[PDB]
Design a protein around this ligand. Structure first.
Ligand SMILES: Nc1ncnc2c1ncn2[C@@H]1O[C@H](COP(=O)(O)O)[C@@H](OP(=O)(O)O)[C@H]1O
Ligand SMILES: O=[N+]([O-])c1cc(N[C@H]2CCCNC2)ccc1CO
Length: 259
């Protein structure tokens, strides 16, 4: 097709939870739009100073009133969301995903995606990467790799608090598998009920380019397979390699599409 000049503003809001293909989707949107897409990895590798800004936004989020109409204090929070997202064309992953309903109002011309997968596969992936059980020794290896990246308790609070925000729950027993499975199902159901159908595309993990591209009115990138990155196995290798080399820059060339 023809080449058109696309606006550098949030055009796609992805409500999918972590471990539902968000990093692949991030990569795919960057291939389509040639501008950056937000993701937790943006925070980790490019913008660690934004950790505190997101935590502040989550803390004050109780002041939001579901619009319409727009109250004054909702606007103060909405304005900070826009600043954090300046220069990006899309959002995925924590901490943004729980803000999907507010992002729809801030960016009324944006389309909304929901990525879903088998709930047990999701839980098992989350346990290996994001939220191991308290008694799991792997939790200590994840912590040791995070130190190499400059991440500490503040980053852990943002991860946990942004999941609590997405699930709308302060008393979340992160060690309880049944609790997390119920929150996952209820979250995904609630997105489908909140977003107008003309604005929403529900994607199952592994669907590939075609439905996404039709939804966005763009051509399929020629000669490019749909990204497949960020498996729990690859996340395990990253953690092990960070612990071994004690720096990111010594190993970054080994993860070309992930990082
Ligand atoms: N194109 C694709 N097809 C199937 N699964 C994919 C995929 N891209 C990513 N994934 C899976 O999505 C999960 C990563 O999601 P996120 O990037 O949101 O953390 C990983 O699951 P596993 O941990 O089960 O391998 C990864 O294997
Ligand atoms: O799903 N992830 O990839 C994901 C991973 C982490 N922690 C990883 C980051 C890299 C160092 N080792 C620990 C934190 C949040 C998310 C949510 O995106």
């Amino acid at each position: 097709g023809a080449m058109i000049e696309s606006s550098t503003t949030i055009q796609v809001i992805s409500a999918g939870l972590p471990r539902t293909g968000t990093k692949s989707l991030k990569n795919a949107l960057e291939i389509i739009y040639h501008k950056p897409c937000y993701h937790m990895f943006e925070i980790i590798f490019n913008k660690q100073s934004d950790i505190i800004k997101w935590q502040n936004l989550i803390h004050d989020s109780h002041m939001i009133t579901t619009p319409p109409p727009l109250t004054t204090k909702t606007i103060a929070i909405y304005d900070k969301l826009k600043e954090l997202l300046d220069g990006y064309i899309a959002t995925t992953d924590l901490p943004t995903c729980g803000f999907y309903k507010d992002l729809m109002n801030i960016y009324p011309n944006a389309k909304v995606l929901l990525t879903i997968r088998d709930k047990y596969d999701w839980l098992h992936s989350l346990r290996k990467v994001v939220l191991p059980k308290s008694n799991d020794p792997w939790k200590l290896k994840i912590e040791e790799g995070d130190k190499v990246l400059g991440l500490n308790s503040d980053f852990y609070k943002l991860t946990e608090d942004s999941l609590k925000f997405a699930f709308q729950k302060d008393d979340l027993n992160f060690d309880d598998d049944q609790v997390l499975l119920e929150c996952y199902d209820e979250y995904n159901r609630l997105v489908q009920e909140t977003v107008p159908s003309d604005r929403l595309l529900v994607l199952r993990l592994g669907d590939g380019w075609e439905p996404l591209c039709k939804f966005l009115n763009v051509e399929i990138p020629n000669g490019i397979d749909y990204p497949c990155v960020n498996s729990h196995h690859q996340m395990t290798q990253l953690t092990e390699q960070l612990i071994k080399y004690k720096s990111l820059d010594a190993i970054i060339h080994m993860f070309p599409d992930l990082i």
